């Protein structure tokens with residue numbers, strides 16, 4: 001939240017060197033909404049190498065596209081040269097704003113706090129409307145992902161989508177197929193944690209994006225009993241659980257191994273009639289919480305797990321080499337079966353986790 005101050009100092013430096021600079025995009029939107037901006041972007045008439053001259057420290061990752069990350073007073077500000085979008089640098093602020101996605105994202109602010117609003121973002125912000133800048137057909141052909149951003153913003157801001165803009169989404173919905181699935185999944189992950197995400201989901205159906213998103217029909221579930229826990233993964237679990245489907249049906253969205261395992265393990269738990277000590281031992285607390293959260297069950301899961309005789313197999317007082325000695329037999333897959341028998345008897349509190357007593361038990365059974 002010191003970002004605005006840093007952006008102001010960036011702007012003074014650029015203007016002192018004789019360039020134009022302005023705050024633009026979401027920070028302006030968020031300011032007029034009374035929020036604290038999460039990121040502050042600066043747009044400037046300076047070219048990237050000219051920016052690097054004025055500040056000691058910078059990151060040149062986005063240089064190709066006009067962006068340089070300035071590091072100042074412990075913050076980072078993206079300074080981007082006036083540009084459209086395969087990237088052309090333009091000479092005036094308005095040429096840059098004319099190509100942004102929505103009126104509320106298309107405003108600029110001077111360091112002396114004047115708002116520059118050539119497209120009515122002020123009014124659309126007051127009236128709670130997401131509306132494309134200029135011709136909605138052009139904005140959505142420039143980048144089809146904007147159709148989905150419109151949906152995300154409606155649930156993030158509790159705005160409506162301009163009628164003309166929504167009809168344009170319906171006409172161009174099929175263009176969604178050309179977007180990298182990583183970008184699709186990133187926006188869907190944001191929808192899943194939004195307040196009033198149910199508004200986003202209704203628009204997703206009604207804009208007939210669910211016809212063309214990957215396995216898009218699976219989003220048309222009832223979302224009324226869904227409340228986010230801040231973790232986007234829970235949205236995917238909910239979806240699958242409502243429809244009695246498996247993780248494999250959504251794999252096109254390219255989940256990490258962590259996400260995959262968490263969804264699959266949680267689904268497993270919802271399929272279980274009853275949970276006993278062994279359940280609480282084999283599944284992680286995170287998996288149990290989401291399976292609970294989605295099945296309506298409520299227990300003190302941390303308390304039940306805290307009370308098991310052991311927490312993981314690493315505390316087992318025995319290993320398969322102990323069983324090789326005691327049995328006289330040769331190492332083989334049979335060890336895994338017997339290690340699990342022993343592990344059960346310890347988790348149910350029947351056998352003590354003590355090598356000597358386990359040895360006594362093992363010789364009798366073998």
Ligand SMILES: Nc1ccn([C@@H]2O[C@H](COP(=O)(O)CP(=O)(O)OP(=O)(O)O)[C@@H](O)[C@H]2O)c(=O)n1
Pocket residue numbers: 024025026027038039099100101102105106143145146149
């Ligand atoms: N497809 C796109 C993606 C971005 N933009 C423009 O990039 C700026 C913010 O991008 P950003 O990456 O910081 C996301 P923002 O719009 O600020 O919302 P958030 O902070 O809640 O994530 C806005 O002026 C948008 O008009 C666009 O015109 N078309």
